[PDB]
Design a protein around this nucleic acid. Structure first.
Lengths: 101, 78, 83, 79
RNA sequence: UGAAGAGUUUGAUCAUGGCUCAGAUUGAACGCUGGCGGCAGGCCUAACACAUGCAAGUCGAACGGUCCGGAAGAAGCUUUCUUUUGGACAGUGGCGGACGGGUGAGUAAUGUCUGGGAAACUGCCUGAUGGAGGGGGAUAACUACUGGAAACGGUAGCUAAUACCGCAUAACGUCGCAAGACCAAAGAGGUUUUCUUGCCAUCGGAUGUGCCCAGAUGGGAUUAGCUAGUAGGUGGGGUAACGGCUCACCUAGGCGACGAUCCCUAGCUGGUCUGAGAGGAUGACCAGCCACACUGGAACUGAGACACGGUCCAGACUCCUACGGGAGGCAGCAGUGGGGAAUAUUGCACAAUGGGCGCAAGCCUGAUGCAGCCAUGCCGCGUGUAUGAAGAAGGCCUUCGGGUUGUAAAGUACUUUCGCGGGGAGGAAGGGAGCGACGAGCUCAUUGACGUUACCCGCGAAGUAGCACCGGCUAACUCCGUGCCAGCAGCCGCGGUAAUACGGAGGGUGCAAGCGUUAAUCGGAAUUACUGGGCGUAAAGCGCACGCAGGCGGUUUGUUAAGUCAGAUGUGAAAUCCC
């Protein structure tokens, strides 16, 4: 986070998929982000589905993904272009999802 | 110019003044030279509304110390 | 009031003290010159016209106390010497 | 103030440098540490020579570096 | 009166060792949710660019004209006009902007901190002494004329003071020698022969400062030799004053491993947080000091600013413009745009307190006192109270016998936050007038933001709750769905058809308008160990010798007594902390 900041905005460079390590197997969704800090790191995209393109531009929280070595940050859904998970009836605090009527 | 005025310890609904001698430059509630007494507008905390300690101010007065209009009233009441 | 008045007075103020010191260094040198030459009479007489003038500059904010006394001492110190 | 030191140099005229030494405890450890200082004391009589352990007192600044003057000589010589 | 540790490197054990955890705090932000009140608190991110308004005047007891107001005249009335008078503006003249307010960029240095020294200075105010005789001179306003689009400007004529200047006395003071000579100063107002305000010179008081000195003040030597005014001397110049501070001449030194020089960084402190202590971190609110207002530099005038709404020069930018030429500079208050995860009313008001000027009346005062916005924090309060089945319905479980959610809801009775009506606050005396000599003193009268709010009385309806978590550490369980797929995850791990660790539901635990999340600070670490540690094999004696500095040093006696120890005294600001 550089300036020891809780969060840090940035613009996605590419939204590709990655495969877990030896014990796990899947297509985890990640994305290279060029934070304002001046660093280009990879962040994980929580949720069952997202809408992050090339010029996504999202805020970074910070969290390592055990399965994906290198991914030390998590994207904050519900902020900027990163739309909150759809139909999230559960932990809406995370994934940034407004409580349905 | 040394002056004898009232320092406001004054708190919410607790207004108390401290007739003190201090340089006119210093703030109203700053470092004072010496306390000569106290004043209680409501005189509720204690029956002794004010304690002038005449002899004390009697010294500062003549030393070049001037008393404000309000303080002069209290001091005059001795 | 007029903030410019204070500006013009200050300028013309220096022009005043500037001339006063001129008279000082002019005669002080004259006295010293006379003393150096050996002319006692003319020298001292010229020395006197330098004393009150430097004393007068002290009267106002021209030369002030100290610096005024300095000049008197230095002048009389240079005249009684070369003489 | 009076200070005791040694005459480590009598090269200059009417001026002698006295090397005063003191012992102070370290602010952290506390163990005694050695510290010295050179002071240009006045000596109009050029009475003090090198090796003389003299006393030094504060006096009217003779010069910019000299603000001390020789008071009395403790011992005769120690090179 | 003050110190609990635990989890994980093994097949198991012990040791070494690193990582990690429950607590408290934050001028925070984010997610879901959200009723009231009191106090407190709010760009912690760009000196990025800025629309608009606002950020010091006051005197007619210093003098001549306009604007606003009153009164009395010449007149039958009107027009017009005359005298007197109040306020104020415009001008002339006097005294004040270097205080207060903002910010921290820059800054390692007697800059600051602590304790001293002296080569010094100080308006108004206060005490004491003495004095105030005679005379002379000058510039605007105003009037007339001309130039310019404007700003504003040129010329001619008149004129005043507590404005300037020359002469007297010497209380004294200055200079040479020793025990001589030189040098000063404006009135005005009145209850006007008496006071009031003010002036000149000198001494002192009060207070505030300039300068110097001892000690103390971060990181790196992959920063080591450095220096010519550079070190010192004589003389001179310069300043309020010491000083190479500057100059001439002479000498040749001065500094360094107790680290100079260079480079990097950050306003400093009282204090704040933490800790058993030592110590570590920090210095944001408030208080002291320091340094900065378009960018850079500079000086003038002054007790003081080298001075935000003063001036001069260089530079960029913005606006105005008949382009000839001008006007500015929100890192001042509020606010706008841009930035960011994020931080507010371009509000009310001076009566109270305080400040500037004035004899006073009085004038000025977004300093401040308040309200507004935001659960940002802290404390207080409410969403109800009592009753109510061996025990409804519904959901859930079942050996379907039954059990569970439950007195929990329904329902009965009671009180009754909001809301409505009435009352309605503390926070504040004089000017003036009467008595007294409109003096001292005494007496009497008139007048308030937040509020019609707080609070009191009366009436009076039951009247929002949510969020996180339940494998272990961590207190709190089942069913279903899914199925190493989807996903979870601080660490150990979990999921390949029976999962308390995934999703839902019932239930349960915690807390409560709050609840979680993210980021940051503290010890445990006796893992730099002074108190508290080690080096034959776990990390660790330099290969040896010689030797400089430095550190350390045998027995007896005497002097000093610097270290050390003891008594007294001064200092150690306030606040804070503790009782």
């Amino acid at each position: 986070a550089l300036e020891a900041c809780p969060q840090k905005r940035g613009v996605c460079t590419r939204v590709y998929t990655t495969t877990p390590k030896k014990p796990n197997s899947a297509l985890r969704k990640v994305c290279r982000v060029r934070l304002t800090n001046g660093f280009e790191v990879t962040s994980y995209i929580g949720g069952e589905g997202h809408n992050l393109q090339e010029h996504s531009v999202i805020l970074i929280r910070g969290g390592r993904v055990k399965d994906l070595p290198g991914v030390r940050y998590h994207t904050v859904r519900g902020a900027l272009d990163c739309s909150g998970v759809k139909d999230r009836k559960q932990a809406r605090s995370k994934y940034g999802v407004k409580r349905p009527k | 110019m040394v002056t004898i005025r009232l320092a406001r310890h004054g708190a919410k609904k607790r207004p108390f003044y401290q007739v003190v001698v201090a340089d006119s430059r210093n703030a109203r509630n700053g470092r004072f030279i010496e306390r000569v007494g106290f004043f209680n507008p409501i005189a509720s905390e204690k029956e002794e509304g004010t304690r002038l300690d005449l002899d004390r101010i009697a010294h500062w007065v003549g030393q070049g110390a001037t008393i404000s209009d309000r303080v002069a009233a209290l001091i005059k009441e001795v | 009031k007029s903030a410019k008045k204070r500006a013009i007075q200050s300028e013309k103020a220096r022009k005043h003290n500037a001339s006063r010191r001129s008279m000082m260094r002019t005669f002080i040198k004259k006295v010293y010159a006379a003393i150096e030459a050996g002319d006692k009479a003319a020298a001292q007489k010229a020395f006197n016209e330098m004393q009150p003038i430097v004393d007068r500059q002290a009267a106002k904010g021209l030369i002030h106390k100290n610096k005024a006394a300095r000049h008197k001492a230095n002048l009389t110190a240079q005249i009684n010497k070369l003489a | 103030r009076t200070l005791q030191g040694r005459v480590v140099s009598d090269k200059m005229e009417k001026s002698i440098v006295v090397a005063i030494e003191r012992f102070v405890k370290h602010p952290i450890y506390g163990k005694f540490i050695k510290r010295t200082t050179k002071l240009h004391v006045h000596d109009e009589n050029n009475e003090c020579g090198i090796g003389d352990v003299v006393e030094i007192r504060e006096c009217r600044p003779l010069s910019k570096t000299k603000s001390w003057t020789l008071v009395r000589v403790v011992e005769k010589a120690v090179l």
